[PDB]
């Protein structure tokens, strides 16, 4: 198998894109560490991966708590000694209305998960990737830094912010042979498996190859 | 005078771009409400504005505290009944090293000022601008959403995030005749007065005119 | 006023944005050299400039030919010896269908005007601006380089192309005190000709030290 | 392997990226139609493809002429009846000086190859792809649309132009199951030809449902 002997951490793995990425990496032989808030929705996906012949485990982790993320990483690295693929996929939305109508607590909840947690996760897993001189950090971004979403202002800030965050970290980590990439829409409707296929393509590149960004347009009809 | 009878709030007004924007708007007749952390550096600038014949006042405000920002806005609107120009200029930097080396508390301090405070300020002053169907919110962004800064990853995230935030809020507010604009570098070295001149140009547009973004390249030699 | 004794070239100056930019520049005291395919469409705008007490001449310039652009600039320089303000405003459209149905002759007509003419104009006037150590070249772009127009593929290319062409020339000419700028829309989704004319006014009359390189404009407030 | 019984056109296929893309596509079982100004520079690459047991033909195509591109595509279609993979890879450079010193003939040579040829090629092969309800058009772009090259102004225009041209054509052709894509650099600041060839391989062999529209590549890990 392409990813046999590897460990893959997928956030927001309970449904949709996250679930599909989990199954895909599991089918290639990676041991998939699934995380989300709801353990029960995770277990369905854990069972499917195992049923089809792969390895998977489930961990509740509240991504808005820094200590919780450090506890989660410490457990994963203590149990398996490595993380080959970190997929930043967990995301929240807020589309209630204009930015002045957004409460600070709603701002905090959205930025904590969409922007701060991918930084915390990279901070928790990158030092191990550096020491091993290998690994992928792959970020699912639902906006390409181009068009604002009226009534989704904080949301937009978090995605363009993620893009700038991870584009910068890519220049920092490449000297240690660690690869940070971005997956984003190339239009403006995408089947989860297509994004899963892109992540699989990223995680199985030749050693020297460094694809930094893939833009995907809606599945054909 | 072009801005006579108007109130202009300028954040980070104690030195450089902020100071220069303060003096410029003061010279056009605006009453300038200066804010920063250090009251003493503010007073020098307050004295210059008054010395040259304008009106100005100084207020310490810690932009990383939401309540402090609401207290500050409440005072300004209670004292003058209006805010015609809000300039988001206060900014912090962090260029210590790669993103995994950045401490969460340093992340928090940078994002609180560069990204959350401009949202809090818009939230505190926009409702008054909406009710009056007029006003400018002008954001000084030191990056145009284009090039990452290695070793300034959080910093980059905060500027691209600001851009997406304010581009979205511009679509929301325009229906109430309130105008959100962005000033940013167009290259890659800029004299503070040139940025001050751009802000003055934004604050004095024809009613109907909506310049949303100005890119500025280094002062000529 | 501000631009007294300057000459401003303005292409596609017979209506809309070009017309307004013409009127706005003349009203600030610049002599407005106007351009269009046909000299008769220009008379109306030339009249409004004079009537308000500014100077204005009219030339037929076919922007699809180099020779034509060369002869046109030669004349302007022989007559006045300077060009202070070159406004690349003329453009064509093509939205007939998908790219593969577009014929080479249509491609050529669109690219010649939208992408090649602004270069030729810059080439013909930049020497005088460089020698004089001052000048503005201002470009009106209907696309900001972000979103594609389906069934306007060549049109899209010509605009993103223009943005790249003039962003680069701007770096080349800074050293000579010549300022190249762009004006483009600020949203994907409606803009009053005067809003643009005002922005152009603003660029044409900046402080010498300052260099505004791009201005994005959103639809006029209603 | 993956591409058995397909035909892949590859322009500028005599060395570097084009050479590698050629080898990589042949090794997956596609018949590789190679292009260059001169048919002799192609023999080496054609030999490597056959030697490894793939098929490959060589044509001299002068991309600066429409007729030439038309005659070239006509031949390929008469000979095989399909083009599965069109790789727009050939390009020229010009970095002689600032835009105003660039002569119209040099402008024309650069634009004809960099911007007009990819359109002409797409126009000549898209009809067959549309009829067949499958096909890839893959474009190699050396600029991502963000940063200007001072003293490479026309070059810059041709690349940002290409990005806009092909982003638009991609929207036009989705409905017919034809997939247009871009490959470009991921940093302002050095990339192994095989990295590109691999990405092209990846695009050429996607699932039918999927549509990757752009791939950015950073310099090869050292
Ligand atoms: O807004 P929305 O309706 O788009 O929310 P949402 O759909 O429930 O969030 C989508 C994905 O991100 C994960 N996620 C959301 N918040 C999280 C948190 N605080 N910690 C960890 N994972 C989280 C979710 O896992 P969970 O739904 O199990 O939290 C889910 O798998
Ligand atoms: O990083 P750095 O070295 O770039 O910092 P910095 O230079 O001191 O920040 C630049 C400007 O932003 C303001 N600012 C910084 N932090 C602030 C805060 N918490 N609340 C309000 N205003 C603030 C500063 O006013 P003050 O320097 O008076 O805080 C200063 O005028």
Numbering used by the authors:
A (entry chain A), B (entry chain A): 2 to 189, 206 to 238
C (entry chain D), D (entry chain D): 2 to 190, 206 to 238
Give sentences copied directly from the paper behind this entry:
Therefore we identified a novel oxidoreductase, designated BpiB09, which was able to inactivate the 3-oxo-C12-HSL signaling molecule. Sequence based classifications assign BpiB09 to the large superfamily of short-chain reductases (SDR). Further HPLC-MS analyses of purified enzyme resulted in a turnover of 3-oxo-C12-HSL to 3-hydroxy-C12-HSL.
BpiB09 enzyme was crystallized and we solved the BpiB09 structure at a resolution of 2.4 Å together with the cofactor NADP. BpiB09 assumes a typical Rossmann fold with a central beta sheet flanked by helices αA αB and αF on one side and αC, αD and αE on the other side. A Gly-motif (TGxxxGxG) at the N-terminal region delineates the binding site of the adenosine half of the dinucleotide co-factor. The active substrate binding site of BpiB09 can unambiguously be located in the variable C-terminal region by the presence of a catalytic tetrad. In BpiB09 the transfer of the 4-pro-S hydride from nicotinamide onto the substrate would be accompanied by a proton relay through the side chains of Tyr156, the nicotinamide ribose hydroxyl, Lys160 and a water molecule, which is stabilized by the main-chain carbonyl of Asn115. Crystals of BpiB09 contain four copies per asymmetric unit, which correspond to two halves of a homotetramer based on the arrangement in other homotetrameric SDRs. The dimerization interface within the asymmetric unit involves an extended beta-sheet, which aligns strand β7 of two protomers in an anti-parallel fashion (A and D monomer). During refinement of the structure residual electron density appeared at the topological switch point of BpiB09 which was modeled as a partial NADP+. The absence of continuous electron density after the beta-phosphate of the nucleotide indicates that the nicotinamide was not tightly bound by the substrate free form of BpiB09. The active site of BpiB09 is exposed to the solvent and the 21 residue long loop likely covers the site only after the substrate has bound, as observed in pertinent SDRs.
